Design a protein around this nucleic acid. Sequence first.
RNA 1: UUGGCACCUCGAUGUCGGCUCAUCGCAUCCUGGGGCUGUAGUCGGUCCCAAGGGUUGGGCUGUUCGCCCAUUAAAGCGGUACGCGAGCUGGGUUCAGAACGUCGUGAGACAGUUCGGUCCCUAUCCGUCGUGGGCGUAGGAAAUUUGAGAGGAGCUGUCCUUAGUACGAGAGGACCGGGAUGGACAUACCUCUGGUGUACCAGUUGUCGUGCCAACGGCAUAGCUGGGUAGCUAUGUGUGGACGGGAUAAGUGCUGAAAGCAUCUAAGCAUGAAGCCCCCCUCAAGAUGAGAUUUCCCAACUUCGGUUAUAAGAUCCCUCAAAGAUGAUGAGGUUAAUAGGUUCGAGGUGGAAGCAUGGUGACAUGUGGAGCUGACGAAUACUAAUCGAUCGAAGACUUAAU
Lengths: 121, 50, 113, 215, 121
Amino acid sequence: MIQQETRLKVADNSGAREVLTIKVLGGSGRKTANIGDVIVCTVKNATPGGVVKKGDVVKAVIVRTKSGVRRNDGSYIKFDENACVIIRDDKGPRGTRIFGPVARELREGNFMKIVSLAPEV
Amino acid sequence: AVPKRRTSKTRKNKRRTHFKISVPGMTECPNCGEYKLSHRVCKNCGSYNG
Amino acid sequence: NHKLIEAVTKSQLRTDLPSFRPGDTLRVHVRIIEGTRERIQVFEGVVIKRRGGGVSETFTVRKISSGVGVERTFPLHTPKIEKIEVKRRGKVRRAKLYYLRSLRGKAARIQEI
Amino acid sequence: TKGILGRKIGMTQVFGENGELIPVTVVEAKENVVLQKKTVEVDGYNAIQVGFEDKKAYKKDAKSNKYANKPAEGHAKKADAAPKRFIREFRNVDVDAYEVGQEVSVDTFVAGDVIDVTGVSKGKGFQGAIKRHGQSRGPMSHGSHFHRAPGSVGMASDASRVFKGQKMPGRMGGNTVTVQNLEVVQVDTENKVILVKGNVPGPKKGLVEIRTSIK
Amino acid sequence: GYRKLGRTSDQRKAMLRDLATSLIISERIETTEARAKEVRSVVEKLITLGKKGDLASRRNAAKTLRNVEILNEDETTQTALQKLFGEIAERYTERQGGYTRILKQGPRRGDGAESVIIELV
RNA sequence: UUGGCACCUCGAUGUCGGCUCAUCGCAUCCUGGGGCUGUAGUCGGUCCCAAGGGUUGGGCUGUUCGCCCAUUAAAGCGGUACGCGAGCUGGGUUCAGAACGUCGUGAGACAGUUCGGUCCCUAUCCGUCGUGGGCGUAGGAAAUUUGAGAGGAGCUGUCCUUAGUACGAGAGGACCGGGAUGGACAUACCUCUGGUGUACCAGUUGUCGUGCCAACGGCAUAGCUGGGUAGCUAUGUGUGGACGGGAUAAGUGCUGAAAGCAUCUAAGCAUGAAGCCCCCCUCAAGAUGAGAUUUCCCAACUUCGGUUAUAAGAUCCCUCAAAGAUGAUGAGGUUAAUAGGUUCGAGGUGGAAGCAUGGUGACAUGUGGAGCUGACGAAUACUAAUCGAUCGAAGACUUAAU
């Protein structure tokens, strides 16, 4: 989520339960990601029965962070949890459901399927 | 780091150009008649007038 | 309290909001310009802190949505809050209720006055 | 094209057109008077001397800078004015648009101008190489005896000396720094205060020069 | 704080309480330049409590003053808390600040520091 | 690189990898500019000019090296005692112990392996980074400045439009242009988000004390715990590498002869790179070549063919911080708000003591957003900057012009 070793849990309907960050994309030397950034991770924990299995290397996007983000109005939003969603090649969720609240900053991006299934945006 | 060469007395006297003291900065006391330190009392009678 | 600062920041102050202290349930009506239509979104929760100031005074509200804690911080005089309600007033013993970040369930309730 | 002198008060914030937050700093520019005009024929370049804050009258028992001295009174009497304690030249302005002894009002700038601000930075004193030059530390454990010292300063007997420009501990701060492309948010009249979007070098009560951006 | 005088935090405040008490018992002491520059604040703020003469003001003064006994003339022994609220407080009922004065003497032998005289005006 | 020689060092020149800090070359990894192509387009191969800037994080191994994983415009090659131990470590190798394989009759040795095993020094000179005194700059001072020179910066990705256009049976798919937004780096600052905040506020534990109940004080890391002003800070907030001129490199040309043709060259005239000089930022008249501008002061004693102090101005001393190792710098010295005190505020904490009321009780309520408060903003001479002293000019000679 932030570093090269952060443990991220998922909130989608896939076999994965927890992932470990491997690389932050978007430039050489970049060492920190935020909400709405794509990362490369590996599945450290998986559930019996599902599409994603343990040890698989997959792509994901960040939807919740504890540090939070700052908006142009001077307001801030912070979460109590760190979460991510495994995406497919065309920026679409591999699962069929989204759990928990999702940051409102995915709406301005091209991740619209994630916002549609999210219970609260 | 020991000195490499003996220091001559020409260098030693040059270095002590600014090693000195000066006068305390005394002023006359117009009650005692003898000099005293500025902004202090007269030691002979303890008069810090004014 | 510099007089020059207090003058150029006088018209920015707005007097329409009620008085409140940390620990009470509060409702915030926020205008959002998501998409192309501007609407109103309502945010509830408990005021966890009130950091003082003048034109730069802020407050934070915390609520539980679907099992995840969410905290929102706004400037007190921002031109994006239509109105503010106070549902109930609580009884607290301090100013910053930072201890509520780790307490969940029956342990995260504030007695009504 | 145009410029003034003023003092730095502090930082604040105001709301924008669409509710956005804009951090601004308060600069007070009052009592500005044109003191001298320089021309190519007399000197070799075109500029104007501008005073900022007026001093008191001449005194026989003066011991501080609050009271102007004899040479400083005759310079402020060539044009009807009061003796000032800050004098600076502006070389980017047009001489034909100014007169000797003319007031320079705060209303020369408008909300929307692009300006640059120069001033003297805050002093930090005698500092080490980590803070003064942003270098990295050595290990804090694993038997290390190297925490905040500078590294190697040369190579070997091949070049038995240290090159000029080596980064060493010293005094930092107190430099003249220009911040370019700043935005004027609001110019206040009857109080002579300019709101500048961003921040300027220096501490409170400092002196800042404001000019139109050259680029 | 203002200045530390080469002492630890706990033992600096104990020295200031002794210096303030002694300036009430004898009303004239001789000490170091730096120490007397900060005893002014302690002593002059304590007389302000004495002028008010409240129970809350008297208990707020008992946490700074030591426990000693006054016996110079033939009359009854008195404390230092009683003296401040009974004798000093009645000499400044018409004075607004400036209850103390400092007079320099000169450097002293063996140390090089200068001694000064501080007394109640 | 592996070697050959044995010219300096054995009354001592201390190795391999890693960390910190760099600097130089071009035989160029990326970016900029061109020629050829078996170059239709997006991609490619090869050669020429070009050193301004840039050139990733991990797993195995003491390792240099190498393999692997995931990115990136790219993950370049070499020199400097295979840069750097009076800047750091000591994992390997060359000490004293012990064991295995093997050789030896033996004490013992490796073509080898395994476990453990003291890293000293107060900087004299040069060099480098900061910061003060003396003298000169032909009378003595206060401000403002020009720039001969020097240093700093120089990087680059992805989407939209042109346009599904040129090109192409189809697959696929653009040069030259116009916008938006990032990555790394540099600098300034504390309004917002956090950190620290040992003379601020509150709660609580054991023990000693103020004679006792209440209220407090000392000790136990600041006893511990929850907040937190100013200052100092990044992870926080702004800004920057822009638009342009002149001469060029590889290339491309116009005209033209030596050589009645052709030909970029011998004369002449053009165009042409992140590269050079300007342009942008900072220092800079000890630049002994010592610059310029605006103000301030101008006499008594002499024959001394020269002194003299005083003026303008600057200090000794004292109260300070926007400054600071000292010194220097800046704000003041009574005709005075410089610091402390006093009276009001900002911010912080969270409802003081006493009394009354309810309860057998630990406790709860009002009086009352109370009480307290370091650095932040104002007003006020109550206290302390008293009284004096020291330094500090009368303008040299020659020539030319009015």
